[PDB]
Each structure stands twice: as structure tokens, then as C-alpha cells.
């Protein structure tokens, strides 16, 4: 209920950032999870300021999509952390 | 890197590198800022005089991303090379190397918001994590 036009958008950087997540090989890393935190959280601000632009509609409804998209961006962000959380043990 | 995944390359520092010559000291400040923990030793670049070799090596890595990605189909190891040349004689930690690509896409990202797509960055981060040795 918040945009037709928004509505997809939100799902469209979601999928970018799955082939995005999805494509990390993580024997190719080499940092800590400290820093691959930071590295995800830039990658998320980054979507973020990216659609800022590309949302549409009024304030209200502006700053509405955005944080839909952060909730989702973190929604899979969130097993994608923990996985390489499981990389350092194993 | 998919025949598909490289000409994803091409076109994406097609459109967006044209100026990563420009951010040396921005990139490698955002890594100082974001990663403090590689602003601990970093006996590079002089700093404490200057900005002129940290700004003459941001030309370098553009130069070279330039060659690299122009040259996917025919030499797989550009970057592979380089970063051995990093880890083994620069004394440049592949993780310092790797996070400085990943700066330096930050910093394209905050200079050309509707250039740097999320494609635009995917098939720039999947190029830059192929740092492997391909054979
Ligand atoms: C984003 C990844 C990077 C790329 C693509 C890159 C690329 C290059 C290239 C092409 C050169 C010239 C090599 C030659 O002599 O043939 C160079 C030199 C050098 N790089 Fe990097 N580099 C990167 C990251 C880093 C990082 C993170 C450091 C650490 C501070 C670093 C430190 C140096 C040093 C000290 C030199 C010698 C510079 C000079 O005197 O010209 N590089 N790099």
C-alpha cells in the first residue's frame, strides 16, 4: 500500500543485491568480520542512496519506500552474514 | 568471469571509470575511515609530506582497471599479477588491496549517483574479486 511504482522498484534492488550477495566467493575474502560488516552496510547505504533517486511520489510516501528496502536489504544481508559468520570457525 | 560477466565489465567501466583516475586520496582515505584497522602501519605513499604520490598512484589503478578489463578475454591474470606484485614487493596486504577497490567503487557510487547502478557495481565487484590465478 504504499506505490505501485515504488512497490517494484523496492523488489528490483532486492534481487540486484541477492546476484550481488550471492556472487561473493568467500575463500576470497580475507577480512574480518568486523570490516565485512562495513563492507555490507556500504554496500546497503549504497543501494539506499541509489534508489533515493529513483523512488517517487511524495515525502511521505518517499521516505516510506526507502526504509521498506533497508528492512529488506538487512532481511537478506542477515544470512548472508551469518554464513561467512560460519566461515571463520569452520 | 561468465563470456557474459566480462562484457558486463566492459560496459560497466565503460561508463563510470572514465574519471577513477581522479579519487586516489578520497578512496584511500574512506579505507583509513571505514577499516582503521589498515590506518595502523601503512608505511606507504609518504603522507606525512604528501599527497602527490597517493594522488599519482589513484592514476595508476585506473590506468591499470583501464588495461585489466579491456583485456579480460586475453589476459585473465592482470589483476591476479598486480596483486601478487602488491602482496610480495610493495608490501601491500591483498586485504589493503581488495579494500581499496572496494573504496574506490564507494567513491564512484558518491560521484555519479545515477551511473553507478547496482548492476553497474555487481559487475564491477565480481571483475575486482576475480584477483585469483586463473589458469
Ligand atoms: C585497488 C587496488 C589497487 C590497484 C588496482 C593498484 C594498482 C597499482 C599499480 C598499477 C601500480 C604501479 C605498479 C608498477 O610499478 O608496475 C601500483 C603501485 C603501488 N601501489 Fe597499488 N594498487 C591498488 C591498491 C594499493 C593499496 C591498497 C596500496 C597500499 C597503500 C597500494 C600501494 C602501492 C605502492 C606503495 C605502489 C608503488 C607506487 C609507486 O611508487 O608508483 N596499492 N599500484
Not at chain 2, 555519479?112 to 574479486?129: C, I, R, W, Y
Amino acid at each position: 500500500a504504499l506505490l505501485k511504482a515504488n512497490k517494484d522498484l523496492i523488489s528490483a534492488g532486492l534481487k540486484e543485491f541477492s546476484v550481488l550477495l550471492n556472487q561473493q566467493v568467500f575463500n576470497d575474502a580475507l577480512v574480518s568480520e568486523e570490516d565485512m560488516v562495513t563492507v555490507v552496510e556500504d554496500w546497503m547505504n549504497f543501494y539506499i542512496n541509489y534508489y533515493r533517486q529513483q523512488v517517487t511520489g511524495e515525502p511521505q510516501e518517499r521516505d516510506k519506500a526507502l526504509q521498506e528496502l533497508r528492512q529488506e536489504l538487512n532481511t537478506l544481508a542477515n544470512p548472508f552474514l551469518a554464513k561467512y559468520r560460519d566461515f571463520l570457525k569452520s | 568471469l561468465s563470456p557474459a560477466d566480462k562484457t558486463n565489465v566492459k560496459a560497466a567501466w565503460g561508463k563510470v571509470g572514465a574519471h577513477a583516475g581522479e579519487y586516489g586520496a578520497e578512496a584511500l582515505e574512506r579505507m583509513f575511515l571505514s577499516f582503521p584497522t589498515t590506518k595502523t602501519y601503512f608505511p606507504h605513499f609518504d603522507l606525512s609530506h604528501g599527497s602527490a604520490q597517493v594522488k599519482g598512484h589513484g592514476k595508476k589503478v585506473a590506468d591499470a582497471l583501464t588495461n585489466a578489463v579491456a583485456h579480460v578475454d586475453d589476459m585473465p591474470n592482470a589483476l591476479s599479477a598486480l596483486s601478487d606484485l602488491h602482496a610480495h614487493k610493495l608490501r601491500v596486504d591483498p586485504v589493503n588491496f581488495k579494500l581499496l577497490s572496494h573504496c574506490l567503487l564507494v567513491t564512484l557510487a558518491a560521484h555519479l549517483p545515477a551511473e553507478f547502478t547496482p548492476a553497474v557495481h555487481a559487475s564491477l565487484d565480481k571483475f575486482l574479486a576475480s584477483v585469483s590465478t586463473v589458469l
